[PDB]
Amino acid sequence: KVIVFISGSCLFGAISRSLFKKLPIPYTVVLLILGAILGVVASNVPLVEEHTRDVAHMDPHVLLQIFLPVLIFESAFAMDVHTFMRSFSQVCILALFGLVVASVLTAVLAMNLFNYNWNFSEAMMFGAIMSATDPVAVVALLKDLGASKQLGTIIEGESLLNDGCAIVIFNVFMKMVFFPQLTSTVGQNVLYFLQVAVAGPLWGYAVAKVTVFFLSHIFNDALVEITITLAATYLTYYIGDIWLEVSGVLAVVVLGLIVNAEKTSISPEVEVFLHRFWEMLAYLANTLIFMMVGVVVTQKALVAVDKMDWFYLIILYLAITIIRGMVISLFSPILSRIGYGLTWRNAVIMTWGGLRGAVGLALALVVENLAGNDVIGSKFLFHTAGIVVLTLVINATTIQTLLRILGMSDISIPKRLAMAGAVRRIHEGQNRTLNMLKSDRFLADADWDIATAACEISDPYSPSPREFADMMEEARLRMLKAEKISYWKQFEHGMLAREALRLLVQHAEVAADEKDQFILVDDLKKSWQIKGIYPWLKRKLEDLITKALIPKLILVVNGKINNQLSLGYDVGKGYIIGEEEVGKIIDRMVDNKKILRELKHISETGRLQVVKELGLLQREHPGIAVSVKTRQAIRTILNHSRETIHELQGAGLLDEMEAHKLELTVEIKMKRLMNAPSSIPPPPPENLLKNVSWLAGDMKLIDFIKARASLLHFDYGEVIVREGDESDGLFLIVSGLVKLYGKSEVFEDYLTVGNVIGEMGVLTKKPRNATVTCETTVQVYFITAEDMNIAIDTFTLYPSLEYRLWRVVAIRIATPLIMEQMAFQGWTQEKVKLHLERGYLVDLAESHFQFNIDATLEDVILINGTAYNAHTREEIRSPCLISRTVHKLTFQYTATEEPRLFVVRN
Amino acid sequence: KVIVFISGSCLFGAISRSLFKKLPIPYTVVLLILGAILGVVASNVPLVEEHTRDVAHMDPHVLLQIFLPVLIFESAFAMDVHTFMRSFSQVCILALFGLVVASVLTAVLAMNLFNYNWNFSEAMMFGAIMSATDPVAVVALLKDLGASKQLGTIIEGESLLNDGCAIVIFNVFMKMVFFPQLTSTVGQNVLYFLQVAVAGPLWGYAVAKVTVFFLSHIFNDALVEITITLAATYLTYYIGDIWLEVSGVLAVVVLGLIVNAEKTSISPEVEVFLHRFWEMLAYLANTLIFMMVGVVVTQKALVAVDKMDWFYLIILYLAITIIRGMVISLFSPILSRIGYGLTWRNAVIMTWGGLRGAVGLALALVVENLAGNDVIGSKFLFHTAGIVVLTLVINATTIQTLLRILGMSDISIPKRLAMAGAVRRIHEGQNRTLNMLKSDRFLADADWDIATAACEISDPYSPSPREFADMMEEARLRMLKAEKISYWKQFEHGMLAREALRLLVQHAEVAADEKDQFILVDDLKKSWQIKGIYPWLKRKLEDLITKALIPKLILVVNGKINNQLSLGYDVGKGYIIGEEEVGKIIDRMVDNKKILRELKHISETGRLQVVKELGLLQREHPGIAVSVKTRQAIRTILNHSRETIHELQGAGLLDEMEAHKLELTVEIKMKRLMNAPSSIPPPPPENLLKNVSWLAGDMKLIDFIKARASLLHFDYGEVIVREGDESDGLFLIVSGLVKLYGKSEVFEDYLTVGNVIGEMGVLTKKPRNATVTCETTVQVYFITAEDMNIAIDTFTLYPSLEYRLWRVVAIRIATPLIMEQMAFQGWTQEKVKLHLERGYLVDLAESHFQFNIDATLEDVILINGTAYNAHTREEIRSPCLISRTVHKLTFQYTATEEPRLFVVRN
Ligand SMILES: Nc1ncnc2c1ncn2[C@@H]1O[C@@H]2COP(=O)(O)O[C@H]2[C@H]1O
Numbered sequence A, B: 001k002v003i004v005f006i007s008g009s010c011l012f013g014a015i016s017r018s019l020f021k022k023l024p025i026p027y028t029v030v031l032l033i034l035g036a037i038l039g040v041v042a043s044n045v046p047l048v049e050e051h052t053r054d055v056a057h058m059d060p061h062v063l064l065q066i067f068l069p070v071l072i073f074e075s076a077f078a079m080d081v082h083t084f085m086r087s088f089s090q091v092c093i094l095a096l097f098g099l100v101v102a103s104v105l106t107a108v109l110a111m112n113l114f115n116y117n118w119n120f121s122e123a124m125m126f127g128a129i130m131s132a133t134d135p136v137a138v139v140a141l142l143k144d145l146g147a148s149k150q151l152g153t154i155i156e157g158e159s160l161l162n163d164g165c166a167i168v169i170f171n172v173f174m175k176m177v178f179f180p181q182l183t184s185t186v187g188q189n190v191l192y193f194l195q196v197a198v199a200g201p202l203w204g205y206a207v208a209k210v211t212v213f214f215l216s217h218i219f220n221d222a223l224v225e226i227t228i229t230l231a232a233t234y235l236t237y238y239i240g241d242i243w244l245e246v247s248g249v250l251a252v253v254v255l256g257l258i259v260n261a262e263k264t265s266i267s268p269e270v271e272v273f274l275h276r277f278w279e280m281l282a283y284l285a286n287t288l289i290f291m292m293v294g295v296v297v298t299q300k301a302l303v304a305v306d307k308m309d310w311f312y313l314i315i316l317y318l319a320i321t322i323i324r325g326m327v328i329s330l331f332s333p334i335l336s337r338i339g340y341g342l343t344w345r346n347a348v349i350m351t352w353g354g355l356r357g358a359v360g361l362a363l364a365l366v367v368e369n370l371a372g373n374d375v376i377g378s379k380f381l382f383h384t385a386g387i388v389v390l391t392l393v394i395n396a397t398t399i400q401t402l403l404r405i406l407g408m409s410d411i412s413i414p415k416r417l418a419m420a421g422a423v424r425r426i427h428e429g430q431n432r433t434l435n436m437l438k439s440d441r442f443l444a445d446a447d448w449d450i451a452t453a454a455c456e457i458s459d460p461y462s463p464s465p466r467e468f469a470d471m472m473e474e475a476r477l478r479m480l481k482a483e484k485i486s487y488w489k490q491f492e493h494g495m496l497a498r499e500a501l502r503l504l505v506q507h508a509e510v511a512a513d514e515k516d517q518f519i520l521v522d523d524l525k526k527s528w529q530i531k532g533i534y535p536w537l538k539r540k541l542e543d544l545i546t547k548a549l550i551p552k553l554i555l556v557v558n559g560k561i562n563n564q565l566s567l568g569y570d571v572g573k574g575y576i577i578g579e580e581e582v583g584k585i586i587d588r589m590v591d592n593k594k595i596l597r598e599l600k601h602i603s604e605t606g607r608l609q610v611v612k613e614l615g616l617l618q619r620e621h622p623g624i625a626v627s628v629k630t631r632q633a634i635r636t637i638l639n640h641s642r643e644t645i646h647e648l649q650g651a652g653l654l655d656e657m658e659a660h661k662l663e664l665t666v667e668i669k670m671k672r673l674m675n676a677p678s679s680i681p682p683p684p685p686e687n688l689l690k691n692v693s694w695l696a697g698d699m700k701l702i703d704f705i706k707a708r709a710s711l712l713h714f715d716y717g718e719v720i721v722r723e724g725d726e727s728d729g730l731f732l733i734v735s736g737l738v739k740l741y742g743k744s745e746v747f748e749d750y751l752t753v754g755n756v757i758g759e760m761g762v763l764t765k766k767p768r769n770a771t772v773t774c775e776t777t778v779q780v781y782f783i784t785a786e787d788m789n790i791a792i793d794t795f796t797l798y799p800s801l802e803y804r805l806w807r808v809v810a811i812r813i814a815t816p817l818i819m820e821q822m823a824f825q826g827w828t829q830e831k832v833k834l835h836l837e838r839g840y841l842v843d844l845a846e847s848h849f850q851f852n853i854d855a856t857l858e859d860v861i862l863i864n865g866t867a868y869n870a871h872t873r874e875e876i877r878s879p880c881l882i883s884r885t886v887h888k889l890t891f892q893y894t895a896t897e898e899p900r901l902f903v904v905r906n
């Protein structure tokens, strides 16, 4: 009968976890005491003796084949795989060297110390016991208050690889000790070790790949994914166990890593459910095994008490701590030299990071029960129980004190300021809306004291060289926060990628940490491109290149390099847009001329270098650029569409059912975006004919233009037309970036594909008024003046296309004037562009040469012509924007030009 | 060895579920066929017969104690408890009558038909086998295309109660048949039946209450809830089974119902994880048992084939169908008479809803295996397998055809129009944002054909009496859609409750069903107030009123009646708001005078009745009104706060860590709102002294006013002041609603608590200009003119309070004038109120009697005084709003009044 024991264990674990969670000490100790308490009555009363003797006397096989695989698979499941594989090499090498040296040193000191009549096998398996560790508690504290990510991942990898090597070493030595009937020839031993090392992971990789391929063809379902995944994990464990009593754990760890790595073939609800399932199983097993070890140690170790071991436990603890410290200190400088070193803080927090856990105690139980009636088992269990109960509390409190005294988990002034500002805005909004609500009729009888008590929130965070140094430091912090606020902004609109975001912000902090320093480019230079071992191996293999695999290998190689290329182009675009924003916003923050001009100069210099390198890599491969541009466009369209549908739901136009259905349709489209192939096809120069906005809807005119245009090419830094020269014709820019300067104070700007050149000269039969110079090798289509007359003829009875053309020629001239206006002060190009789009162009014929000016219109600008005022009678040279005091405007008949104007009504 | 059997079971279930899901036929029979296939190859090969013999000949005990509890607990878990308890009485009586009459008729026809040498017990247990049914398939089809909720709930309840009664009857009679050694004295039998009926549900209720109480004290945790809930369910099942072979299933069903009923003590993620867990377990058991029955029937029934039973199966099917149809038809008129009847469509959809499922087949396996080597078990298994395989496919195809031909699942024109409009808005938004994006620099090289192909979405839904009748019908539909669009709006801003929302919209739907009809009031009359059995019993018990329970009983009674009171007041408020809004908006939809005036008259009439009854119930209990008002206020403040923090996240001002933290703080506050006690304390008339906006911050003046004001009371429909009479003084309205009419065309309006009366007369030393009449018994505070002079004295060096007073007296006069303005055409009171709040009042001293008028100001209005124009020199009687052509305004020195003006700048 076992029900009462398991139920009591669950209840005690729940109550302890609830009660004792406030203190930083892990709960696991106190329940251990409960087990000891039970031992006190276990001998005393026959009843509890009956129950605990029924349970505690279990076979070692059940523990060895059940409790360990669950624990290790849990330790391997909940882990950011990407952060792991970004530090895999250093974490694995350091972990395995550290574990082997720790094991051998503690074994030889055990030989030197106890004078126990032991072979080297006992010592080395003892060392394998103390080599293991528990990462759940330390990562729990770090997620509680440490506020660091990389530290948790590296300590997790440390613990995981340590546990794997420890368990294989222990199992093989247990076989070799307690089953002496087996031969130990070298060939079978090395063959066994090699197949343990290799075949397991390959078997796990194969089963993971095939089950992911199976899952890839199932959509909008929930049950089949869970059932298939659980069945696959069990079959993997069963095969890997029947072949080897070790290979199962490594195979299932590899399976867990691979399954976690995949994301797009498994919906998020499935993975959150699986995460919770495995976490619950691990928690239950951990609680049961801790209570079990508590009762067995308090009922066995009472007969082997003396001062000798009670004094030697302390020196054992000091020994393991000092050896771990010296080995990691010895490996610090080589990691620094290789370019993968850490700080003092990381080293010292890793130094006291080793927390012995359930794995070592499980090994203690299995060796104790398998050893039979002997003093060795009692000594083993007492030693490991004492060492774990000591090290848990001591190392927990020293981590707490160390985190306080070194204080890397301190708060920073900038984020405190940001939180204070956010709370200010929230409380202001609350005040405004409650003041609005107070005026309502029905909602006036409410007592507002309890209201303002309940609704209110709280902040959770609560000449000289010296002056020049501190002001440039605070300017450095201000440009840092301007950068990071910008980067968060473009990510939120949907202009950039999440991993690109984290890479770029971590570049931000690492630039921030250095004194009087900002973001460099050598780190970026290595960031966007790759000269490593992967490009060399891939180029040499594709140059030197059973038949069908090779195309698959080369295509997956091209995919794996294009991914890095895309990420690099993305981070370049994000960095450049961030620089231009911070430079354009910081121009009025401070008045110290030298600092502002020097920072603007270095920002401009870096801008030039990054745009130069970006142009170089763009010329290397345009297809990746067009692919990422399309991906960006679809991302942002989907984002804005989902915002619009949420808004439409907000006005109540839809029941929740159809909103839910359309949300799923949008989510399906986004999921298809994730699996969009990174194809790199350059677009032909003929699709753009249909993509012109003001040539849209005219197939006949498009064909005529294709039959009446000349392809023109220009080299780097060439000039097409110059200011004041005769109108050579009309052009459409279709490749490259171009610069333009003219009379507006000479204005200068840069335009790109999607513009017409020489429109004013063709419309007015007038020479050039500005100079256009191409910045690189470009191509355009040129249209002659006779072809322009033919186009005017082919306008026929639809000059609304010509009306849109006149709208564009008004767009050319109005936006600089609207920018130089007080009513649109501080207005972005998007704001003004979305403003005048709703406006309409007007002629003088529909007004019969006389217009009345009302207050309905918001803005009005006339381009050219002969217009007079009816009341003021003042000759004003158009374009000219004045106040709305003028009410009537008179017009005359002119033949040299056609007078028109534009109105925007709000 | 059974591993290959279970693994193949899972694989076949997954592939059959995935492949065959498109067709309306349930997947199950497909795998059934596979089981049959296995049978015919089971005899072929020793290996397969070895495996199938190993697994198939399990004990009856394992199936009876494992498979059934899981299946019934799943059937009882996934269910809306509220919709169940709103139809509990009818569903339970109908289910139990139907099952008992079905069982007895099947038994007697079995005696008349087969001529099998059977006692009556075999006949009735055999009949009880097909009394059960499966609801998962039919609810699956209904959620697929039926688009009905109540039908699924009622058929689920029918199936659940049918299964419970069937299983208890079967258990007791299999015990009585196959164990004849037991005595059948009447006393023990009736005692056993009564205790099975009662003690089980009470045991489940007790354990559910105690475990919910235990869970109520644990916050921000995930593991302990899951572990405690699962442990509680297991202990309940174990105790219920050890006490009685039947009571376990009923006890755990009650436990599942109660646990599902509670929501606020368990976070949503725990609830969804538990649902997925139990669903997966049920699916696994169902698949295994179906393929198991398939193989056993195809390997046993091959030896008992003849034309006889093969002919009698059809008439057995016809018999069960006709008896179910006739009994439900017989119960239709009595349910109609009692007031709980259903339509023809509901009756016929219930008629063909009976789908035999896994429960009957499990009973078949247990009776077959327990019967041993006999012809009876083969006959039972063949009969039930044939009847289920027939009924599933036949009733599925006929239910599909019936849904098609009767077409209650048809689409309606209004929602088709709504979806069309929504699709139009989404597509136009996409076009606008892509046209905006086309202008950007970097995002110009993308080929937009693939872009517009990928981003595009599609609609998923793709004189005479006759003319008078159709136009009034279309007006009826238009007012219906206006109402429902309103109610969705008030719910979405957070002004109403979800269950109140669904209640109101189902009233709207059932009113819409009737021809030339709209929403009545008698249905509302029973909706808000309750005259049922509960108020009578609660009144009699509290009047007639081991010691400590009675206060708990009376308090929970008061809570359970105040809940209904709150819901009624809520639905009244929602309906009055909705009818007012639709009456406001429909005034310009149509031009036919008689229909519009008649509908507006009946709407106003119903408005008068509902406001009268609402005032009556408010006078009955004011405390519930103040409680619900406070709850409404906190709800809407929290809603707007979450909106603005999402907005702040949108501008990138916050990392999503702190956004997540603040979201949890808001969620904690909202959860505390859920558990807010419905206390009903009326507010004292003294807190409002501190709650005056323009008396805020002046404790000394508040104390002075409390020492210099008179409490005044008025009866129903009384008059305080009249237009043209002398200024009696100054008042502050602090109780009730009041009406006011004056000269603006006489304006009339209604004001409430939070206003001052006679301000203009006190400021100007002038008599009344409008008449104020109270609509009910009201109370105010009155201030004399000498006290007004004392208040002016106590203004001291802070007349900014008097400036706010002048802002209020400008609020009085400006809003009717701003309403009568073209620039604010179509503007709501919220819009204008949020408009002029940012404005500022101005005097003539700071301008030195001369003001220059710029374009920065958006609006300007002068109240009174002697102002002249510098340029126009036109005498304009203030207040008067004109165009901004005036640039300079001159002022003089006046002693009889103080001239001031107000400006709003945009
Ligand atoms: N404000 C402006 N914005 C954009 N393009 C312009 C502007 N002013 C002049 N241009 C272009 O510069 C060209 C100079 O010669 P054209 O007059 O032939 O046609 C002119 C336009 O194409």
Ligand SMILES: Nc1ncnc2c1ncn2[C@@H]1O[C@@H]2COP(=O)(O)O[C@H]2[C@H]1O
Binding pocket: B727, B742, B756, B757, B758, B759, B760, B761, B762, B766, B767, B768, B769, B770, B771, B811, B812, B813, B816
């Ligand atoms: N437009 C208005 N809005 C609100 N209250 C008003 C308005 N016009 C007049 N009153 C009130 O009606 C009162 C009539 O007499 P009094 O002039 O003493 O003070 C006046 C104000 O309190």
